[PDB]
Amino acid sequence: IVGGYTCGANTVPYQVSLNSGYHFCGGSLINSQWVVSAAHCYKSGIQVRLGEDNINVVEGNEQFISASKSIVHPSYNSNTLNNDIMLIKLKSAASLNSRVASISLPTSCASAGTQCLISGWGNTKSSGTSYPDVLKCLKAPILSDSSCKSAYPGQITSNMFCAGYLEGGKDSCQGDSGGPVVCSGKLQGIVSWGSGCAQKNKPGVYTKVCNYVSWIKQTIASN
C-alpha cells in the first residue's frame, strides 16, 4: 500500500497473508473454512496466516493453517486477468474471535464514489521497494466505469472496477494482490493489477466480487 497508514493490530480481522516461506499475496476470510484471493496468486504449498499484524514476529493471535484446496476460477484468463478470483479451503476451520473474523459478501454492487478500505503488506513505495512489517490501510473511492475505461482503454471487463486516485501517490502495490477492498462492511473487490503503482491517471484495478457471489456460494456448497 502506497500513501496509506498503519492500520493498527487486528483492526482488519478478515485480512489474511498467504505465505510460502514469505508473504506473497493477501486474501479475505469469508467463513471459518474459506478465503477469497486472486487467481494469479495460485501456487502449491500455500499456508494461510490469520490474525497477523507484524508478519515477521510471532506476537500472539496468529493462526497458521495450510490450504487444503485452492480453486482458481475455471474461466480465469491469465493474459487479460478476467475472472481473477480464487477460493482457498483451509485444512482446518479457523477459530473465530475479535481478531480473526469473516467479512460479508455483497448483496449488490457498490456505486461510484463509495469509500472503501484497501489493506495489505505490499510495497509502500511507488519507485523502489520497501516492504512493511505491519499491515497498512488506505481509504479509496470507487471510480466511475467511464473514467476507468478512459484510463485503461480496451482492458477493463465487466468483472473489473477501478478504485483510488488519479492524482498519484495513493494505491495498492506489489504484495497486496488478492487482498480486500471493503465498502460499507462488504467485500466488493480483490486487489488485481494496475499500470505501475500510485502513478498519475493510472488507478488500481480490482476484481468485482459482486459478480461472483453465486459462484462462490455454489463452489463452497459443493466442496
Binding site: 493474459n79 495498492s172 502495490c173 506489489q174 488485481s192 499500470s195
Partner: peptide, 14 residues
C-alpha cells in the same frame, strides 16, 4: 505495461 500486484509481479507488454 499492466502488471499484477503479487510477489513477484507478472507483467505484460502493454
Amino acid at each position: 505495461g499492466r502488471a499484477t500486484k503479487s510477489i513477484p509481479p507478472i507483467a505484460f507488454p502493454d
